[PDB]
Amino acid sequence: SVKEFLAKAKEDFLKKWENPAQNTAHLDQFERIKTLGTGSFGRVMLVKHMETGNHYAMKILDKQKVVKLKQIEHTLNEKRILQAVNFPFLVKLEFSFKDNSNLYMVMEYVPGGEMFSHLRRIGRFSEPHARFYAAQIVLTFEYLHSLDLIYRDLKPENLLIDQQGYIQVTDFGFAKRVKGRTWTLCGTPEYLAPEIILSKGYNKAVDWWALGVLIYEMAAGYPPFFADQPIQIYEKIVSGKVRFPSHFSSDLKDLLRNLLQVDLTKRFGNLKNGVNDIKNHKWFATTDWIAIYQRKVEAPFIPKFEEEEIRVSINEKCGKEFSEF
């Protein structure tokens, strides 16, 4: 039935992936409540859809700035992916549209902060706390991999902790729909699998390696392969040799040896049973997968967390570059 859940999820996905929804709202439909922050391409605003009452986080991206920063492909890709997927631990794109000046990504409003800064403050997560988060990433990758997506940007900064203490994976700029193998070097050095570094071509198992890195970092407070220079980071990754903190349970060490496995024919998540090798591992014995998916487990930690015009030019900017948006 997991099989049948995933098959239906793939049908929903392919439909939207092949014929992406465009201009599913317009700016005059939203009441502007508060600017939450200013990102690279423009502001993020709390808004309310005036026709329903639902509140959202609307990201505004100035098209000319996206072009200037050479982020057209990443922005288009992220949007195309986000409008086509649906899973409890993936940021939800509710509406998108564009006008003469801007692109708009109307996201579910999910206050809370990223995992990097939370981890820095807390120091390290206990093993139950780390397992709770890891379980959500496991289910999300099970979902994304079933759709032939490789996420390939897993790092703590890409994991929001929401108002319920659950994980939301954000930033699908690098994600690629890949049937088979691919070659592009992207992502943050610490989290890269050996086969990426050595330009061997790679598959979805790079996400399972990155999960290994994430779990270690969550539980240790620092990633397994670190150095001041990226070449020394690469050297460590390629060696395979991982040293564990002394407080790591025996079960955690074993899981991590199986995820941080250089040999692809032994790496958990890359074998005949796929994700189930990970889900059945002793470290996850106490994990109630269904309760996690249904958001019924109480989270170990609940985070605490002058208005200016949106000027729309009378001239369309960068129309052809963003045709697909």
Main beta sheet: strand number and arrangement? 5 strands, antiparallel
Shape type? globular
The overall number of domains is 2
Radius of gyration: 20 Å
Explained architecture:
This protein is of the alpha+beta class and 325 residues long. It folds into two domains: 2-19 and 114-304, Transferase(Phosphotransferase), domain 1; 20-113 and 305-323, Phosphorylase Kinase, domain 1 (2-Layer Sandwich), CATH 3.30.200.20. The protein contains eleven helices and nine strands. It has helices at 2-18, 63-68, 72-82, 115-122, 127-146, 194-197, 205-220, 230-239, 250-259, 276-279, 289-293, and strands at 30-38, 43-49, 55-62, 93-98, 102-108, 149-150, 159-161, 167-169, 176-177. The strands form three sheets. The chain has a five-stranded antiparallel sheet. Strands 6-9 form a two-stranded antiparallel sheet. Helix 5 runs antiparallel to helix 7 (205-220) and helix 7 (205-220) runs antiparallel to helix 9.
Element layout with pairings:
Blueprint: H1 2-18, E1 30-38, E2 43-49, E3 55-62, H2 63-68, H3 72-82, E4 93-98, E5 102-108, H4 115-122, H5 127-146, E6 149-150, E7 159-161, E8 167-169, E9 176-177, H6 194-197, H7 205-220, H8 230-239, H9 250-259, H10 276-279, H11 289-293
Antiparallel strand pairs: 1-2, 2-3, 3-5, 4-5, 6-9, 7-8
Overview features:
Transferase(Phosphotransferase), domain 1, 325 residues, protein serine kinase activity, 2 domains, two-stranded antiparallel sheet, 14% strand, five-stranded antiparallel beta sheet, cAMP-dependent protein kinase catalytic subunit alpha, monomer, alpha+beta, Phosphorylase Kinase, domain 1, 11 helices, 9 strands
